[PDB]
Amino acid sequence: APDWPAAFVRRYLDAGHWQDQSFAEALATSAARHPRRIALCDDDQRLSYADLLQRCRRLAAGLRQAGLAHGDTVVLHLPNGIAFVETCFALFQLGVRPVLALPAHRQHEISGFCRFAEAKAYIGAERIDGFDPRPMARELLASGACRMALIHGEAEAPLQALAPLYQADALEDCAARAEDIACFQLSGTPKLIPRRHREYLYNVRASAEVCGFDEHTVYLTGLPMAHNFTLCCPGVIGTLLASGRVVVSQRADPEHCFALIARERVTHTALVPPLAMLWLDAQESRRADLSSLRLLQVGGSRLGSSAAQRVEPVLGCQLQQVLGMAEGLICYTRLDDPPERVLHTQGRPLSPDDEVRVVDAEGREVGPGEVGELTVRGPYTIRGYYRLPEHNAKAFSADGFYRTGDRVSRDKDGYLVVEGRDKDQINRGGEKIAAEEVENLLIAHPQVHDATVVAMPDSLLGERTCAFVIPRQPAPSALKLKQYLHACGLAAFKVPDRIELVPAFPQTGIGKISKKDLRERLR
Numbered sequence: 001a002p003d004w005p006a007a008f009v010r011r012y013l014d015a016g017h018w019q020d021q022s023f024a025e026a027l028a029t030s031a032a033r034h035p036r037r038i039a040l041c042d043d044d045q046r047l048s049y050a051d052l053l054q055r056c057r058r059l060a061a062g063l064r065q066a067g068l069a070h071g072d073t074v075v076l077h078l079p080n081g082i083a084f085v086e087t088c089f090a091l092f093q094l095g096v097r098p099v100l101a102l103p104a105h106r107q108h109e110i111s112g113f114c115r116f117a118e119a120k121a122y123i124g125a126e127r128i129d130g131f132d133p134r135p136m137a138r139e140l141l142a143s144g145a146c147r148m149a150l151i152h153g154e155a156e157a158p159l160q161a162l163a164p165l166y167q168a169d170a171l172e173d174c175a176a177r178a179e180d181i182a183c184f185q186l187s188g189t190p191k192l193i194p195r196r197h198r199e200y201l202y203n204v205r206a207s208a209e210v211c212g213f214d215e216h217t218v219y220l221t222g223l224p225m226a227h228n229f230t231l232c233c234p235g236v237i238g239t240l241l242a243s244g245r246v247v248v249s250q251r252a253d254p255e256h257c258f259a260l261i262a263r264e265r266v267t268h269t270a271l272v273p274p275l276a277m278l279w280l281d282a283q284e285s286r287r288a289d290l291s292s293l294r295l296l297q298v299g300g301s302r303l304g305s306s307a308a309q310r311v312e313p314v315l316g317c318q319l320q321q322v323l324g325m326a327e328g329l330i331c332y333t334r335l336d337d338p339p340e341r342v343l344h345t346q347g348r349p350l351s352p353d354d355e356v357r358v359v360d361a362e363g364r365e366v367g368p369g370e371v372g373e374l375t376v377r378g379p380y381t382i383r384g385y386y387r388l389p390e391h392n393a394k395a396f397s398a399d400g401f402y403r404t405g406d407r408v409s410r411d412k413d414g415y416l417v418v419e420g421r422d423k424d425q426i427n428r429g430g431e432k433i434a435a436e437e438v439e440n441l442l443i444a445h446p447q448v449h450d451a452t453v454v455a456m457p458d459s460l461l462g463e464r465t466c467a468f469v470i471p472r473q474p475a476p477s478a479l480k481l482k483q484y485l486h487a488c489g490l491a492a493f494k495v496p497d498r499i500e501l502v503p504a505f506p507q508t509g510i511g512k513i514s515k516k517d518l519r520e521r522l523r
């Protein structure tokens with residue numbers, strides 16, 4: 001667990017970025033401001049700030065009685081829900097660090113997380129993302145992967161029930177210091193990202209300012225709450241610390257979510273592009289009343305200008321583009337930015353002390369507007385992954401810059417434009433091709449729902465291109481789309497060598513497209 005050198009600590013405290021409260025103290029402060037206001041809602045249950053705080057304290061007492069102590073680690077694998085929030089904040093109070101596993105994670109990942117972190121417990125549910133994790137949890141215990149397995153819901157011994165632990169008398173003490181690790185986030189087997197209370201609260205508080213969160217923010221969880229976008233950018237925690245209300249959802253389909261928005265008067269949410277595409281193309285479901293919606297954050301992957309330009313007309317809300325990473329840096333377009341920035345950039349950095357360097361293969365800083373590897377250090381960017389000295393020696397420069405693996409350029413005013421991952425690059429007979437440019441043209445096509453362009457081996461040109469396209473009916477042929485690209489003025493060498501009409505793309509844990517999976521499919 002590498003830390004910030006002393007010069008940086010001192011400057012981030014002097015700047016006022018790092019304050020002296022833990023997550024638990026911060027929620028308690030917010031609760032005290034508005035104790036009866038509804039803080040969380042699910043399909044039936046609604047908790048006031050004061051009821052949430054008390055339940056968290058009661059769960060904390062129960063977890064302590066069950067053996068969880070300050071400095072312990074747990075693997076937290078729960079669907080979106082009230083239990084996720086309660087359990088997180090109870091662990092924050094106790095100084096117990098949760099590994100924030102995603103709903104899509106399975107035994108390979110879960111086992112690795114328990115083992116690598118030496119978790120005392122796995123905390124899970126009777127069901128998650130269509131998966132029954134209780135067999136796995138039994139094997140975790142049988143193999144020594146963790147000591148204990150708590151299940152919210154029904155489960156057979158040797159698994160233990162989480163609900164009885166809420167019956168304890170409320171623990172009133174906090175064991176967490178602002179400089180301690182609060183939780184382990186996960187890289188997008190995922191690496192463990194040690195996030196500390198004071199820096200990750202800076203992340204939350206400043207994001208909430210930039211995104212205009214306030215007492216009236218009604219935040220819908222469009223993504224897994226474990227994920228950093230959903231949790232802190234500004235996320236669920238930004239909503240709670242602004243004294244807003246969080247509306248939980250275990251699904252992001254526009255059918256369900258549009259009705260929730262109407263029911264709860266949702267004002268804010270966050271999505272990855274593929275989900276935003278579904279919301280933009282939702283047909284009869286758009287009969288819903290979405291008048292309450294004020295801000296749609298889109299991030300995780302680039303939202304091209306063809307799609308971005310449809311957000312305000314179709315949904316009636318402002319768009320914000322978010323370039324983010326669990327390791328640190330967040331860039332945001334700002335709520336008062338002109339369209340040219342919101343449609344065509346992925347934001348500018350959150351903190352004045354975020355230090356960004358775009359560098360070529362040699363480590364040279366590129367010229368302005370030129371494309372290079374994004375690297376960065378700053379007041380909420382880690383200095384290394386948890387207990388990973390050998391990987392850390394490659395992933396961080398000697399002066400402490402995190403090497404993101406993304407290819408970006410910068411515009412005149414500091415805004416980042418993401419070309420994609422280093423591994424997404426296409427070189428077609430020595431001509432370079434920016435997938436995003438071709439993807440954005442195809443996505444503008446009226447019978448194209450989404451598109452993704454990747455590299456395939458070729459003996460003569462080294463690489464050719466293949467575009468995967470989800471049609472909307474009536475679906476165009478590959479030949480019609482090649483002609484449509486031509487009529488748009490796309491350079492000939494950039495027209496995909498191959499276009500695959502398909503109903504869906506493989507997806508990552510939170511819904512991003514897996515170009516790795518596509519590129520392994522081709523070869």
Ligand SMILES: Nc1ncnc2c1ncn2[C@@H]1O[C@H](COS(=O)(=O)NC(=O)c2ccccc2O)[C@@H](O)[C@H]1O
Pocket residue numbers: 186187188228229233298299300301302303321322323324325326327330346404405406418420421
């Ligand atoms: N607007 C964008 N345009 C192009 N690419 C983007 C991108 N936003 C992310 N990426 C890619 O996603 C990696 C990080 O992924 S992440 O840890 O899961 N966390 C997130 O995505 C995340 C998103 C929002 C807020 C907090 C977060 O933590 C990045 O290095 C980069 O490759």
